[PDB]
Amino acid sequence: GIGSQNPWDTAWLWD
């Protein structure tokens, strides 16, 4: 994601 809760994905966390 870009700032969800899961581990850092595209940007922040994994939405």
CB 1 within 8 Å of CB 14:
yes
Structure tokens of 8? 């850092």
Residue 4's φ and ψ, nearest 5 degrees, are: -85, -115
CB 15 within 8 Å of CB 2:
yes
The 3 state secondary structure assigned to the chain is: CCCCCECCCCCCCEC
From which experimental method does this structure derive? NMR
Neighbours of 1 (CB within 10 A): 14
Q: Rg of the chain's alpha carbons, rounded to an integer? A: 5
In angstroms, the CA 10 to CA 6 distance is 11
In angstroms, the CA 4 to CA 10 distance is 10
Structure tokens of 13? 């966390």
